[PDB]
Paper text:
To generate high specificity for the RAS target sequence, the active site was modified to be dependent on a cofactor (imidazole or nitrite) and protease sub-sites were engineered to create a linkage between substrate and cofactor binding.
The aromatic ring of the P4 side chain has common van der Waals interactions: the Cα and Cβ atoms of A104 interact with Cε1, the Cδ1 of L126 interacts with Cδ2, and Cβ of S128 interacts with Cδ2 and Cε2. Because of the space created in the S4 pocket by the L135V mutation, either a water or an ion coordinates the hydroxyl of P4 Tyr, the hydroxyl of Y171, and the backbone nitrogen of S132 in RASProtease(I). P4 interactions are facilitated by a significant shift of the loop containing residues 130 to 133 of RASProtease(I) relative to the Protease1(N) complex. Mutation of S101K increases activity with Ser at the P3 position. Hydrogen bonding interactions between the backbone nitrogen and carbonyl oxygen of the P3 residue and the corresponding partners on residue G127 are conserved. Structures with a cognate peptide bound show that the L135V mutation allows space for an adventitious ion-binding site that coordinates the hydroxyl group of the P4 tyrosine of the substrate. This stabilizing interaction may be an important element for rescuing the active conformation of the catalytic region and enabling strong cofactor activation.
Numbering used by the authors:
A (entry chain S): 1 to 74, 84 to 275
B (entry chain B): 277 to 280
């Protein structure tokens, strides 16, 4: 990664890089606004757009998908990225497009899906698609949501709220929960999500914040783990990440805590 | 659905 970010070190990814693990032979689908494949620092192995008004997955008119792709590669420099456009330039998309992206990922043997997206209300059809991806063996990771808190209510967005999906909240560089990061019992783990520098469309770079930035740290961690343990199931990868996380406080706010990919990968 |  050309642009320096604290987040890679914070999740203990360099320990895996020192070991020789970089996420080789792991297919990671970025279900987002596209990936700017023309960026000199990003290689994209394949993809598909399901947004009828934005037909090219290898451009990104929003910036999030490109940034997220870069974070996956900062954590797992050898991962294979796939651009699955399910959100338009305004960052918004429909259930059915998301489903089509999940279905494509299953058909194309993805190992990991990242969904840095959410709705306050669930789709029963998206639930069916994410459940099927997990049953098929895919590690499904999602942003927990940027809906802050609501007293004792969960604010975890869908599909992160489903049991089958790993719900990733955001901490800052001090390991404090970001004010925006959604909360609730459905929260699994935390990762860095404040002022993360990564790739932006047009060969650019910059900092963004959100649970959208936290999720790809966990997707990249999954790729690192699979490169060390290519025989592990998605169940085992998920267990590793959750059971070895660094506890940070009450699970309503932090889940199991900050991922520690060095511990997760043994 | 929105980007987070
Ligand atoms: Cl959903
Ligand atoms: Na975006
Ligand atoms: Na979940």
């Amino acid at each position: 990664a050309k642009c320096v970010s604290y987040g890679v070190a914070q999740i203990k990814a360099p320990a895996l890089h020192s070991q020789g693990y970089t996420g080789s032979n792991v297919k990671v689908a970025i279900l987002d606004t596209g990936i700017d494949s023309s960026h000199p620092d990003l290689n994209v192995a394949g993809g598909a757009s399901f947004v009828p008004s934005e037909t090219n997955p290898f451009q990104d008119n929003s910036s999030g998908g490109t940034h997220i792709a870069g974070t996956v590669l900062a954590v797992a420099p050898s991962a294979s990225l796939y651009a699955v456009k399910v959100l338009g330039a305004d960052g918004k998309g429909q259930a059915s497009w998301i489903i089509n992206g999940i279905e494509w990922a299953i058909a194309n043997n993805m190992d990991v899906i990242n969904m840095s997206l959410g709705s306050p209300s669930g789709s029963a059809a998206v639930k069916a698609a994410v459940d099927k991806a997990v049953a098929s063996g895919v590690v499904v990771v999602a942003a927990a949501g940027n809906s802050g808190t609501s007293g004792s209510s969960s604010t975890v967005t869908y599909p992160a709220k489903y049991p089958s999906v790993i719900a990733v909240g955001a901490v800052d560089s001090s390991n404090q929960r970001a004010p925006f990061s959604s909360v609730g019992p459905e929260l699994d783990v935390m990762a860095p999500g404040v002022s993360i520098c990564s790739t932006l469309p047009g060969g650019k770079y910059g900092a963004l914040s959100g649970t959208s930035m936290a999720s790809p740290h966990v997707a990249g961690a999954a790729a690192l783990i699979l490169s060390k343990h290519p025989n592990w199931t998605n169940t085992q990868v998920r267990s590793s990440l959750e059971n070895t996380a660094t506890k940070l406080g009450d699970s309503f706010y932090y889940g199991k805590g900050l991922i520690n990919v060095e511990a997760a990968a043994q | 659905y929105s980007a987070m």
